[PDB]
Design a protein around this ligand. Structure first.
Ligand SMILES: Nc1ncnc2c1ncn2[C@@H]1O[C@H](COP(=O)(O)OP(=O)(O)O)[C@@H](O)[C@H]1O
Ligand code: SF4
Ligand code: SF4
Ligand SMILES: [Mg+2]
Ligand SMILES: [Zn+2]
Lengths: 63, 57, 416, 194
RNA sequence: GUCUCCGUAGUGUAGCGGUUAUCACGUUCGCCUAACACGCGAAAGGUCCUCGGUUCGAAACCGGGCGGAAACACCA
RNA sequence: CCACUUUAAAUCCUUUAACGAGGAUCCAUUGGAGGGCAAGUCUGGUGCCAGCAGCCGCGGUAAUUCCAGCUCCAAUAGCGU
RNA sequence: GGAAGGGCACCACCAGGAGUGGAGCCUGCGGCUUAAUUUGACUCAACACGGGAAACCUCACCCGGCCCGGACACGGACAGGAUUGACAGAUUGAUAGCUCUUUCUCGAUUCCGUGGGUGGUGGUGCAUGGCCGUUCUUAGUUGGUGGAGCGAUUUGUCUGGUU
RNA sequence: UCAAAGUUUAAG
């Protein structure tokens, strides 16, 4: 079982749940403002250029 | 021919084990009593095709 | 070329080391060796019979594997038409190894050097003892056989029995049947005889010398009739050749029929040559210690340091030596170091935690040191000298000084 | 049949000033063995004459000339009558004092002459190279030595020593010559001796 | 030094200027045998020691080369 | 361990006061445990090796025979060679 | 048994036939070769045999890559969400979210030990079962009681004819 | 009313 040096293992992922996640803001105490855009058909996230979903897998980008 | 090499091969690589503890065993007459008592009085049961004083299944 | 020969020797050493380790099941392996003079047909017949005998071996696993091993060697021998010079060596088998990999294997090769050893063996391992013995004994010896009939010159490795050159001569009669002429004929007879000795000596210079320095490490004169004596104690015989004359052997017979006789009688004296060279070497090393000098060094911790620096002239080692060069490596930081460890310090050692960082410093596997010396003594100063434990000075060097040291090219100071 | 004896001159051996030394230059210690034991601390260096080669290196290194290594025959190891410390002097046998006969020791100094005189006086118990009186008497059987020591041990024989060093006597005793003789009378034979 | 002869498949030998270079063994390949041996059937293999000549043609006839082996070396 | 006795003088036994047992202590051993032949088809290691075995034998990767642990057997201040 | 008596079989012979052995190819096998050319079986009783005419699958072999289909428990792990499952684009054979990058998710799955499973066309048919095959397709094999022998054994189960 | 027919792992 001589494992080759340059091949090595391929590490799997490690998630990072960065505490409680925020998607809203408090406007005048009573009312609320939403930060990120939502699905049409659930927040479609802000990719650096794209707008990618996290469930139904829909995608968008304003050129 | 044949080398005097392996000399104490098996004595060497055997797995060493501690010799346990139990009791100061009975000696002299007392021992003989005890062995008399465990042939002739304690057990003396209904037979089931012969006995075995160090039996093990 | 000399360098190409050295590479081929190393390749075959490596090959032998791999074969020794092999191992397998029952008696599956087929260590086979053939001497150079031998006929291949004769070996092919032998193997065929051995195949026939194997064809009733009660076991399953053993039998089939052996048949297929003998089948393979027979096929290898069909590829040759003659046993090549140097002999042949054939190693067939069905080796077990890691990963449960029962792999078949066949290594025929014409070995470096003429070997004189036949061998057939079946076993669980390969029998590479004969080869290792031929690799060790590089000391060639020379053999001059004098006789009134005719001479012979030959050489002798541990096993191998060579014939270099020979001639015969039409020498005159012992007596002259005239009163006055008896004296003159006698003087003429002694001149003819001296010219024969002179001719022999010249032929010895031609043969045994190589680049104005004798190739043979020994030189046996054999024969009878105080003729070999005339050769050793004579001014015609060159001193550089004469200085290495080790025996004068009284034999019966003459020529090739006596050559083997002369070897048998001379065998004890020939084996002792290596032992004498050791005594001289270690004796020279221990001279430096007896006087102040400070050329000498000893122990891996010092001798290697000396070798790295202002180098050694001669590096002297025991044959066997335990000590081993490991390569230690770090998990996180990728820092590494190499150390030369004893049998107890190498087997189990809690030293090798990284400490400064705070991790387990894993010891990646060794290359054994004496082999290490052999690999790159050319890199350092040179003249790697292995010595035994047999001589009284040698036993001191092994037992006392740890079987490792060196005679240095100049004076060196040490500390700690 | 030859063995070796290490000797450390305790007056000269000062382990603090020199450093460790011996260890560093000894080929048995550089191998990794207990041939020499020193450290910067502790007094005097110890050497195992078992493990010692007798290479003659440590003597050349040591800065004071503290160390010596000699060769003694292996026959003598059985017949050791005294050894005070490790890496020190080793006396073999004792002279055989005979009653009513004046024993004449002859031999150069520094060859265990004083220690023998002390043993025979009865000051020093023969440690016998161990470093016991029934064991000592059994060692000395078949010879007048066991007679001598048995005489010493129950009948308290009085050991008296005319000393070597005469110039140290004036700076100890006081008074006239006649007064000291008068004080030390037991036989009462001043005049005849005088 | 002389005179003589012989150098032919792996081995030992035949060979009368025009030969597929003879025979035996060895070798390989079948078969036979459980296998082997023997046996049977097939096959492969010559720098004809080396060079030059004579010859329409030379393995041979002739010359020299390199090897090998017998006999002679006597009268003082 | 006081004392007596003993004894040529002692010792030892004997006599006798005073201290003197929870077994972790005041600790029983030597050889065996396939057959002959009393007593394990127990568990771990080795793999025709190391070794045992007076004899027959056991050992070549499920050793009742090897080295170990456990249990058991024989005799027991003894028991082996 | 290259001993003697019977008596029998075209896997024996005879008398014949059809051949095979020679040719080409089909295929099995051994060898060589190869990363790998997977493997069992070698006298009848191995070799167009494994129902074995494999493109893939089959598939074990080799060289690449995913996945867990790692049960349960004891615990640690419990929410400042343990840490199952992801379009990019680089990479990759791949439109394997396999990885690096970057948004989000079942929400009680997890990860780590230990016990321990589980799988395996891995090893062992000289550890076995079952099933075949063969000895051995011939006429053979058996005990009770009695008889003969110290007994192993033998008789029955046979001189002869008959099938 | 008698031709020839030799041998069989060390690998349990
Ligand atoms: N009490 C002691 N401790 C350590 N060493 C000693 C002692 N006495 C003497 N020596 C050493 O022994 C050596 C010789 O002393 P000693 O034997 O008394 O002399 P001699 O040999 O003349 O009889 C001295 O050199 C000294 O170093
Ligand atoms: S003499 Fe004995 S001790 Fe002194 S150095 Fe040489 S070996 Fe070490
Ligand atoms: S021996 Fe000389 S060197 Fe070694 S310690 Fe004693 S003094 Fe220092
Ligand atoms: Mg027994
Ligand atoms: Zn969506």
């Amino acid at each position: 079982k001589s494992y080759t040096t340059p091949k090595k293992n391929k590490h799997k992922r490690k998630k990072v749940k960065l505490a409680v996640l925020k998607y809203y803001k408090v406007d005048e105490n009573g009312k609320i403002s939403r930060l990120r855009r939502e699905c049409p058909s659930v927040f479609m996230a802000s990719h650096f250029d794209r707008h990618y979903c996290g469930k139904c897998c829909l995608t968008y980008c304003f050129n | 021919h044949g080398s005097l090499a392996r000399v104490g091969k098996v004595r060497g690589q055997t797995l060493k084990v501690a010799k346990q503890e139990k009791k100061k065993k009975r000696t002299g007459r007392a021992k003989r009593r005890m062995q008399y008592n465990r042939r002739f009085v304690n057990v003396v049961p209904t037979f089931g095709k012969k006995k075995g004083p160090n039996a093990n299944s | 070329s000399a360098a190409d020969r050295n590479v081929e020797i190393w390749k075959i050493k490596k090959l032998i080391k791999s074969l020794e380790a092999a191992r397998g099941n029952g008696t599956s392996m087929i260590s086979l060796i053939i001497p150079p003079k031998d006929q291949i047909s004769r070996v092919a017949k032998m193997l065929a019979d051995e195949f026939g005998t194997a064809s009733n071996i009660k076991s399953r696993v053993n039998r089939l594997s052996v048949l297929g091993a003998i089948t393979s060697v027979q096929q290898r021998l069909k590829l040759y038409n003659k046993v090549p010079p140097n002999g042949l060596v054939v190693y067939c088998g069905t080796i077990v190894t890691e990963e449960g990999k029962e792999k078949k294997v066949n290594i025929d090769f014409e070995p470096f050097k003429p070997i004189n050893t036949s061998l057939y063996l079946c076993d669980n391992k390969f029998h590479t003892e004969a080869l290792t013995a031929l690799l060790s004994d590089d000391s060639k010896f020379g053999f001059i056989v004098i006789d009134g009939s005719g001479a012979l010159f030959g050489t002798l490795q541990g096993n191998t029995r060579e014939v270099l050159h020979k001639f015969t001569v039409d020498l005159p009669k012992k007596h002259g049947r005239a009163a006055q002429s008896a004296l003159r004929f006698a003087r003429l007879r002694m001149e003819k005889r001296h010219n024969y000795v002179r001719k022999v000596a010249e032929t010895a210079v031609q043969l045994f010398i190589s680049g104005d320095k004798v190739n043979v490490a020994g030189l046996v004169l054999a024969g009878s009739a105080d003729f070999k004596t005339e050769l050793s104690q004579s001014d015609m015989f060159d001193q550089r050749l004469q200085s290495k004359v080790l025996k004068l052997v009284d034999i019966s017979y003459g020529g090739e029929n006596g050559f083997n006789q002369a070897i048998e009688l001379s065998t004890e004296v020939l084996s002792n040559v290596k032992f004498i060279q050791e005594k001289k070497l270690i004796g020279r090393y221990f001279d430096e210690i007896s006087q102040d000098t400070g050329k000498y060094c000893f122990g891996v911790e010092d001798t290697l340091k000396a070798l790295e620096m202002g180098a050694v002239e001669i590096l002297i080692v025991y044959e066997n030596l335990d000590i081993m060069r490991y390569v230690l490596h770090c998990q996180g930081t990728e820092e590494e170091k190499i150390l030369y460890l004893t049998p107890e310090q190498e087997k189990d050692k809690s030293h090798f935690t990284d400490k400064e960082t705070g991790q387990e410093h894993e010891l990646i596997e060794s290359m054994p040191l004496l082999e290490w010396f052999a690999n790159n003594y050319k890199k350092f100063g040179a003249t790697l000298e292995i010595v035994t434990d047999k001589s009284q000075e040698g036993s001191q060097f092994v037992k006392g000084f740890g079987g490792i040291g060196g005679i240095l090219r100049y004076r060196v100071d040490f500390q700690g | 049949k030859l063995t070796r004896i290490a000797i450390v001159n305790h007056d000269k051996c000062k382990p603090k000033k020199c450093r460790q030394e011996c260890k560093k230059s000894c080929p048995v210690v550089r191998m990794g063995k207990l041939c020499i034991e020193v450290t910067p601390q502790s007094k005097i260096a110890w050497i195992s004459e078992t493990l010692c080669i007798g290479c003659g290196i440590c003597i050349k290194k040591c800065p004071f000339g503290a160390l010596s290594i000699v060769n003694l025959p292996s026959n003598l190891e059985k017949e050791t009558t005294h050894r005070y410390c490790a890496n020190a002097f080793k006396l073999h046998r004792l002279p055989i004092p005979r009653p009513g006969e004046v024993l004449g020791l002859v031999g150069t100094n520094g060859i265990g002459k004083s220690t023998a005189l002390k043993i025979l006086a009865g000051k020093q118990k023969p440690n016998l190279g161990k470093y016991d009186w029934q064991e000592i008497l059994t060692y000395f059987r078949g010879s007048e030595l066991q007679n001598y020591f048995t005489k010493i041990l129950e009948d308290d024989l009085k050991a008296i020593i005319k000393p070597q060093y005469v110039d140290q006597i004036p700076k100890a005793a006081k008074g006239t010559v006649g007064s000291i003789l008068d004080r030390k009378d037991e036989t009462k034979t001043q005049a005849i001796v005088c």
